[PDB]
Tab-separated table of N, CA, C and O in Angstrom:
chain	number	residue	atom	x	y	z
A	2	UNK	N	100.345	134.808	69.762
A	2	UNK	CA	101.304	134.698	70.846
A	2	UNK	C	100.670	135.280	72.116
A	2	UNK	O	101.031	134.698	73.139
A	3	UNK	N	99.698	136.425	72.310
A	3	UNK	CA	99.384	137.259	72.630
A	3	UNK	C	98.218	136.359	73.609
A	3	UNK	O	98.090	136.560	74.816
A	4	UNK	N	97.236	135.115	72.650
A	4	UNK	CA	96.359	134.152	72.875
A	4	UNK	C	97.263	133.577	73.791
A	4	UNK	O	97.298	134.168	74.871
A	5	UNK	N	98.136	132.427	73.661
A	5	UNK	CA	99.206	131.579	73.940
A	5	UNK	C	99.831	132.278	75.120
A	5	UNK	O	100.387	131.530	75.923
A	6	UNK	N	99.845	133.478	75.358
A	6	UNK	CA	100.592	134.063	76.675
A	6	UNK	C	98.990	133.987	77.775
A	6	UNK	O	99.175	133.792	78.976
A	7	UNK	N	97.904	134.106	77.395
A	7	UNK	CA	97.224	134.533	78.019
A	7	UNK	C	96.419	132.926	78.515
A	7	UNK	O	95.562	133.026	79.393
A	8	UNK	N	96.636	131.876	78.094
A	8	UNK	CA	96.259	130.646	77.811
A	8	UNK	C	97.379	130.441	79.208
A	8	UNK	O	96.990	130.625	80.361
A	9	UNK	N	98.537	130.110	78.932
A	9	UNK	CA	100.036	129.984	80.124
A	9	UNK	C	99.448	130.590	81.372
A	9	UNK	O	99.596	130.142	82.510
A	10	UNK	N	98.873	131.489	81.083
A	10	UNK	CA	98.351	132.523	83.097
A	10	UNK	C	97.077	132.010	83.156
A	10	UNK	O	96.648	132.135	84.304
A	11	UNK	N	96.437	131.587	82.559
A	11	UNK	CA	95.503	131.515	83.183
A	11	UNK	C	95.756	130.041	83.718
A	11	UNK	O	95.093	129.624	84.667
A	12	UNK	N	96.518	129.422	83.229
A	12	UNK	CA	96.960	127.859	83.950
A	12	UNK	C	97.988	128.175	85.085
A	12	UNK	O	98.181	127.214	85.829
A	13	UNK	N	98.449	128.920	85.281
A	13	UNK	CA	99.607	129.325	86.235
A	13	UNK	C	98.787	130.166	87.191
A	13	UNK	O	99.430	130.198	88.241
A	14	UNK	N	97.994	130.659	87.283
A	14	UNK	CA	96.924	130.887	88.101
A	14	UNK	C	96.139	129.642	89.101
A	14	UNK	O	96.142	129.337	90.294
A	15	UNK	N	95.534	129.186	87.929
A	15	UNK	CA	95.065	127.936	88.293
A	15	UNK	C	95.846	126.932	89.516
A	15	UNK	O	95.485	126.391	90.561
A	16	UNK	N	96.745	127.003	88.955
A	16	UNK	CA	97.655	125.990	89.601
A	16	UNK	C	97.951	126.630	91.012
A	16	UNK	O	97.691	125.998	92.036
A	17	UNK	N	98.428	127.729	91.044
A	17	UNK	CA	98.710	128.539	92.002
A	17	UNK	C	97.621	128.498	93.024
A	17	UNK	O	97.712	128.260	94.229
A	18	UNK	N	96.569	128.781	92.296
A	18	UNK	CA	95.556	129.049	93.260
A	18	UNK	C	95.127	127.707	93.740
A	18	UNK	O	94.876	127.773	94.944
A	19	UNK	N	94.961	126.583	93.281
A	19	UNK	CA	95.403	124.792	93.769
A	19	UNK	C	95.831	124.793	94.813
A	19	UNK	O	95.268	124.268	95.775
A	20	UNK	N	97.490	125.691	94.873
A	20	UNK	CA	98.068	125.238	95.916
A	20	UNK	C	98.130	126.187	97.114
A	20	UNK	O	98.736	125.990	98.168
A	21	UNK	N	97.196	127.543	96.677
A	21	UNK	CA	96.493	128.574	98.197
A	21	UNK	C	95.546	127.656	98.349
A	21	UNK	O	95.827	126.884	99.266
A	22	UNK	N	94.401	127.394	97.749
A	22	UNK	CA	92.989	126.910	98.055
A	22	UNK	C	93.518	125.485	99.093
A	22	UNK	O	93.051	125.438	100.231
A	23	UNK	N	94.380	124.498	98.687
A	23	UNK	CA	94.960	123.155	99.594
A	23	UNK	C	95.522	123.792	100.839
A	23	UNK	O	95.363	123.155	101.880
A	24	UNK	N	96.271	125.163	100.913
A	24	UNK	CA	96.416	125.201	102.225
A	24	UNK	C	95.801	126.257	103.098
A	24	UNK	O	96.292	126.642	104.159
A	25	UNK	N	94.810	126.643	102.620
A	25	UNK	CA	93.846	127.245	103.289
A	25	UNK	C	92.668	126.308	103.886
A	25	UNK	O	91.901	126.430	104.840
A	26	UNK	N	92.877	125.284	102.861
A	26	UNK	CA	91.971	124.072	103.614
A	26	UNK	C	92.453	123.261	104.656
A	26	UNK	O	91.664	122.786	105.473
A	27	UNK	N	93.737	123.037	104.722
A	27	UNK	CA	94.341	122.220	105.671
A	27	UNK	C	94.255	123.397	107.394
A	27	UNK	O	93.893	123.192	108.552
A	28	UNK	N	94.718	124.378	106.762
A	28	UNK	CA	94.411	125.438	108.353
A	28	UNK	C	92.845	125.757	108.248
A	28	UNK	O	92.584	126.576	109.129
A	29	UNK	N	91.814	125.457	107.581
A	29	UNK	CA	90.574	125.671	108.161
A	29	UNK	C	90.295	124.627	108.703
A	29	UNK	O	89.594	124.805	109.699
A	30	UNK	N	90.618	123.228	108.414
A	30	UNK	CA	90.524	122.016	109.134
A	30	UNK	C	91.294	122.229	110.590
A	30	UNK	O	90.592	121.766	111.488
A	31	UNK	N	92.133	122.613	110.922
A	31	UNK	CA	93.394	122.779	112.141
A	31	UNK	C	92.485	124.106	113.349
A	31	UNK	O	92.266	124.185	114.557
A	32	UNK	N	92.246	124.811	112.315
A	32	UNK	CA	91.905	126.036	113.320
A	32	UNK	C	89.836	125.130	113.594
A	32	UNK	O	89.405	125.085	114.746
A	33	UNK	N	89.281	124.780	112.859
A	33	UNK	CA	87.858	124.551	113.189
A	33	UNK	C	87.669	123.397	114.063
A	33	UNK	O	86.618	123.196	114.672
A	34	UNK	N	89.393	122.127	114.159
A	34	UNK	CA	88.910	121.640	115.242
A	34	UNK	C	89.595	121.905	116.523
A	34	UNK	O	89.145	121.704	117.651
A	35	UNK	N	90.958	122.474	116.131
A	35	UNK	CA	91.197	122.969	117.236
A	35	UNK	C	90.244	123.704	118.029
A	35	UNK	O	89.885	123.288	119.131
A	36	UNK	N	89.803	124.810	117.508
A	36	UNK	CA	88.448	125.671	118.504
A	36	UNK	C	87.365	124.891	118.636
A	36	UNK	O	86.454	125.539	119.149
A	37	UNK	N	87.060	123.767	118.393
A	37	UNK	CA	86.219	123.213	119.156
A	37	UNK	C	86.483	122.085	119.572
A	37	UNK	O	86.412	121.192	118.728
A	38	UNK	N	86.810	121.762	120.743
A	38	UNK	CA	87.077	120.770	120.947
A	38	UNK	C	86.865	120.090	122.436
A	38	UNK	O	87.193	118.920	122.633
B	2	UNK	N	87.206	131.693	75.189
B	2	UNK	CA	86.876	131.607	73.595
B	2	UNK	C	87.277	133.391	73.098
B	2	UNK	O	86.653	133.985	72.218
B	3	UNK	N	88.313	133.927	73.811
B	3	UNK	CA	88.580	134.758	72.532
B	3	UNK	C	89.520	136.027	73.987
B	3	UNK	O	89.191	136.088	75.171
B	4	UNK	N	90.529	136.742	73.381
B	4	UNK	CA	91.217	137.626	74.644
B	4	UNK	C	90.044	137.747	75.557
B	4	UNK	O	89.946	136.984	76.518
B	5	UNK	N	88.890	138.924	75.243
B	5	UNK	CA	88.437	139.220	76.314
B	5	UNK	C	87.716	138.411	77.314
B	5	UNK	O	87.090	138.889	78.260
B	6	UNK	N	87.851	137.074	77.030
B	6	UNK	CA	87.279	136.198	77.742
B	6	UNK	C	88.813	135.683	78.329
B	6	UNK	O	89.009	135.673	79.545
B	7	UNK	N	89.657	135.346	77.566
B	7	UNK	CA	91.053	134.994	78.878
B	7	UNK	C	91.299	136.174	80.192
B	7	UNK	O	91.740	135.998	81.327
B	8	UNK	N	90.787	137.487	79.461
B	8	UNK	CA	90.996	138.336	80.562
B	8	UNK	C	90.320	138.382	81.908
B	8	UNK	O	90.682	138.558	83.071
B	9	UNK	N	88.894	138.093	81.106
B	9	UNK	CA	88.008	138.286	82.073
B	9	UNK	C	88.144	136.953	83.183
B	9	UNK	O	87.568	136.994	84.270
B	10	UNK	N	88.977	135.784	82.759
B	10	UNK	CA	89.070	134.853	83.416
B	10	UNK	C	90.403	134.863	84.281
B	10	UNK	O	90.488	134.312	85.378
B	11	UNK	N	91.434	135.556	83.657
B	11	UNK	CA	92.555	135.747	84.377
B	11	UNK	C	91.265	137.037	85.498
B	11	UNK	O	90.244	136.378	85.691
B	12	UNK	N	91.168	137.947	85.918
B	12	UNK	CA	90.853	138.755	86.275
B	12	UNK	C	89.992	138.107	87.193
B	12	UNK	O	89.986	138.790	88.217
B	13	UNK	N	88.990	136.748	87.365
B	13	UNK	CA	88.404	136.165	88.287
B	13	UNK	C	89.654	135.568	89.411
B	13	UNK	O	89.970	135.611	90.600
B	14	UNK	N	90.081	135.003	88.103
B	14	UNK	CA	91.055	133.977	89.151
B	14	UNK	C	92.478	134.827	90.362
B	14	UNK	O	93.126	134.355	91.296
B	15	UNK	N	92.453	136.219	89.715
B	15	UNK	CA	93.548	136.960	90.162
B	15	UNK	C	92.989	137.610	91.660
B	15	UNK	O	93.698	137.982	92.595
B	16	UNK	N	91.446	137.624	91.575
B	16	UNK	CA	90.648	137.846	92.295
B	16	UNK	C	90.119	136.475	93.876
B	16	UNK	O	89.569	136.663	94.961
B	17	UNK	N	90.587	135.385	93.280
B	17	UNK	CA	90.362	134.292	94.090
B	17	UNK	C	91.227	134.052	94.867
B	17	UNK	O	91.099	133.735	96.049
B	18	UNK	N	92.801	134.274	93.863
B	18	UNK	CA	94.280	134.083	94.238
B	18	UNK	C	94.268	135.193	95.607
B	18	UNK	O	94.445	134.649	96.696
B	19	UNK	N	94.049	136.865	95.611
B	19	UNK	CA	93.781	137.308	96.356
B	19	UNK	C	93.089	137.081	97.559
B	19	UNK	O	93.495	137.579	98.608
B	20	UNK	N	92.138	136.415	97.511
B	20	UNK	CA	91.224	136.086	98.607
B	20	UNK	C	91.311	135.029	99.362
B	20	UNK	O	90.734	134.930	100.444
B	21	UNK	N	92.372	133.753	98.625
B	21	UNK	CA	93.057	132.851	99.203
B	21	UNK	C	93.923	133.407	100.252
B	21	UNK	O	93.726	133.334	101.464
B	22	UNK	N	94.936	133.988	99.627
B	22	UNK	CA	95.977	134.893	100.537
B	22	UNK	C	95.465	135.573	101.571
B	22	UNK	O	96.050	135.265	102.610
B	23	UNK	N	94.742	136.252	101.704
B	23	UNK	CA	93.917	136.965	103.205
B	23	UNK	C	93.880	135.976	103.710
B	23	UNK	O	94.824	135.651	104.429
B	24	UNK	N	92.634	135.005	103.507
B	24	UNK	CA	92.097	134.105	104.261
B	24	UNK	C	92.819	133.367	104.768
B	24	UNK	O	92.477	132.926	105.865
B	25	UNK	N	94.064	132.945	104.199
B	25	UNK	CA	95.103	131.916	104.771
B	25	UNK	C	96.043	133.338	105.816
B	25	UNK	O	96.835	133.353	106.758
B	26	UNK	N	95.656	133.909	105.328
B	26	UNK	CA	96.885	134.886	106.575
B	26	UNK	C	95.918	135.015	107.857
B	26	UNK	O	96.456	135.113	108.960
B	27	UNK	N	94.350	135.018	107.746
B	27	UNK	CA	93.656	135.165	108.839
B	27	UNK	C	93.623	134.228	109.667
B	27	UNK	O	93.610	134.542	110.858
B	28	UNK	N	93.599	132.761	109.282
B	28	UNK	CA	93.392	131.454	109.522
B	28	UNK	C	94.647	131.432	110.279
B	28	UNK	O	94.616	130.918	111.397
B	29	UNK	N	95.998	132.027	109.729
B	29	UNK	CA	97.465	131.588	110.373
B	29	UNK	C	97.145	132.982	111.950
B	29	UNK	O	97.454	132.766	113.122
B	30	UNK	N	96.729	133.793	111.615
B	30	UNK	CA	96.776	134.083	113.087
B	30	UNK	C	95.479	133.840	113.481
B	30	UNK	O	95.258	134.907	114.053
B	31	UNK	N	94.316	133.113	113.602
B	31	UNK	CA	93.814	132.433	114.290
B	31	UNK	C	93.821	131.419	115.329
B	31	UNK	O	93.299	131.288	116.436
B	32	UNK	N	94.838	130.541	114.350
B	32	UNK	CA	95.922	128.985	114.321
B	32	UNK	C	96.789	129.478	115.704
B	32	UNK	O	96.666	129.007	116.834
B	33	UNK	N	97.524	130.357	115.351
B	33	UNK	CA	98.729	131.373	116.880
B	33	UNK	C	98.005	131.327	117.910
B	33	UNK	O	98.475	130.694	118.856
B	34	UNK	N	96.727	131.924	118.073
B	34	UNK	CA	95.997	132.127	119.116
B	34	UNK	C	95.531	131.291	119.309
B	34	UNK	O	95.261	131.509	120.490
B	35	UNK	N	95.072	130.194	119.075
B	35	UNK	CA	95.101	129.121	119.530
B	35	UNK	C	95.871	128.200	120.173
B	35	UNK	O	95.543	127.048	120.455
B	36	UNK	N	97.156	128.878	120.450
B	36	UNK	CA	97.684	128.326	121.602
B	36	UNK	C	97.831	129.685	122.155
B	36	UNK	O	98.243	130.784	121.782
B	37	UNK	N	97.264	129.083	123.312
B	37	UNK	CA	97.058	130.045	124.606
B	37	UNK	C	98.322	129.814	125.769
B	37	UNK	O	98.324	130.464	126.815
């Protein structure tokens, strides 16, 4: 169970971090062309 | 392949999750100042 709990976070991590990493990319796109432009 | 390897992998990723979060909070006041 102990396996099986630790299996669940590390996908709920994953996922999570999917959806920081997508919008950290969308504002590095926004802020890198905004400042140059 | 075995706990101390889920840990050690939760423990990367908890570490990335972190570093997402800064970086997107730095980027959002970057983004602000950019309008002048």
């Amino acid at each position: 169970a102990s396996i099986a709990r630790l299996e669940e976070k590390v996908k709920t991590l994953k996922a999570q971090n999917y959806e920081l990493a997508s919008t950290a990319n969308m504002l590095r796109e926004q802020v890198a062309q905004l400042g140059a432009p | 392949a075995s706990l101390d390897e889920l840990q050690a992998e939760i423990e990367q990723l908890e570490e990335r999750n972190y570093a997402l979060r800064k970086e997107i909070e730095d980027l959002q006041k970057q983004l602000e100042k950019l309008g002048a």
